[PDB]
A paper describes a structure:
Ferulic acid decarboxylase (FADase) catalyzes the non-oxidative decarboxylation of ferulic acid to produce 4-vinylguaiacol. To understand the detailed mechanism of action of FADase from Enterobacter sp. Px6-4, we cloned and expressed the FADase gene in E. coli BL21 (DE3) and solved the crystal structures of FADase and FADase in complex with a substrate analog sodium ferulate. The cylinder-shaped monomer of FADase had an overall dimension of 25×25×45 Å and is composed of nine β-strands, two α-helices and two η-helices. The FADase molecule could be divided into three independent components: the core, a helical bottom, and a C terminal extension.
The crystal structures were determined to 2.4 Å and 2.1 Å resolutions respectively for the pure FADase and FADase complexed with sodium ferulate. There were two molecules in one asymmetric unit with a Matthews coefficient of 2.6 at 46% solvent content. The results also suggested that the biologically active form for FADase was a homodimer. The core was formed by anti-parallel β1 to β9, which together form an open-ended β-barrel. The helical bottom, composed of α1, α2 and η1, η2, was located at the bottom of the core β-barrel. The catalytic center was located between the core β-barrel and the helical bottom and was surrounded by α2, β8, β9, and the hair-pins between β1/2 and β3/4. The C terminal extension, which contained a long coil with η2 in the middle, was located behind β9. Comparison of the crystal structures of pure FADase and FADase in complex with sodium ferulate revealed that an active hydrophobic pocket was formed when FADase crystals were soaked in a solution containing sodium ferulate. In the closed form, the two hair-pins moved towards β9 by about 5 Å to seal the pocket and shield the substrate away from the catalytic center.
Residue numbers in the entry: 5 to 166
């Protein structure tokens, strides 16, 4: 059944892009995620309660897609059976130009982001398209507010320490 997000809702995942960029996702429910970026262009950025379109595309392969307040588009592939992760991120020109002003707990700064989104140049878009190694998987149940509750810099040095 393609409409059964059963095996994916509650998923907490750590994974490293072929470019070295390190990222972490928590699938909060059938339309919501939390995430926390640990390194790369926008390292330390993190985000609770991002509306996402979440679907099943294979027995155990799921897709998540969403749009940011910054103008960024994301579409991710998590293959749980084969342990394969694929991410495409379309960033606006100004994020590439100035990544450091997207770096924050976004929830405190959503009108700031909308501001940058209409000033710095939208275009041309940077497509960053990349495979990642899933470094950790876990299930944490639905609506769990405490999976992603601080910045990555606040975590043990270590993280994971499970």
């Amino acid at each position: 059944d393609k409409h059964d997000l059963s095996g994916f809702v509650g998923k907490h995942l750590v994974y490293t892009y072929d470019n070295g960029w390190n990222y972490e996702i928590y699938v909060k429910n059938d339309n919501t995620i939390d995430y926390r970026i640990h390194s790369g262009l926008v390292g330390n950025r993190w985000v609770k309660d991002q509306e996402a379109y979440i679907v099943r595309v294979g027995e155990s392969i799921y897709k998540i897609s969403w749009t940011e307040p910054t103008g960024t588009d994301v579409s991710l592939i998590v293959n749980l059976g084969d342990s394969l992760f694929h991410g495409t991120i379309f960033f606006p020109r100004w994020v590439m130009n100035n990544p450091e002003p997207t770096v924050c707990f976004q929830n405190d700064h959503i009108p700031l982001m909308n501001s940058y989104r209409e000033a710095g140049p939208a275009y041309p878009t940077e497509v960053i398209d990349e495979f990642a190694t899933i470094t950790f998987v876990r299930d944490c149940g639905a609506n769990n507010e405490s999976v992603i509750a601080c910045a990555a810099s606040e975590l043990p040095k270590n993280f994971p320490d499970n």
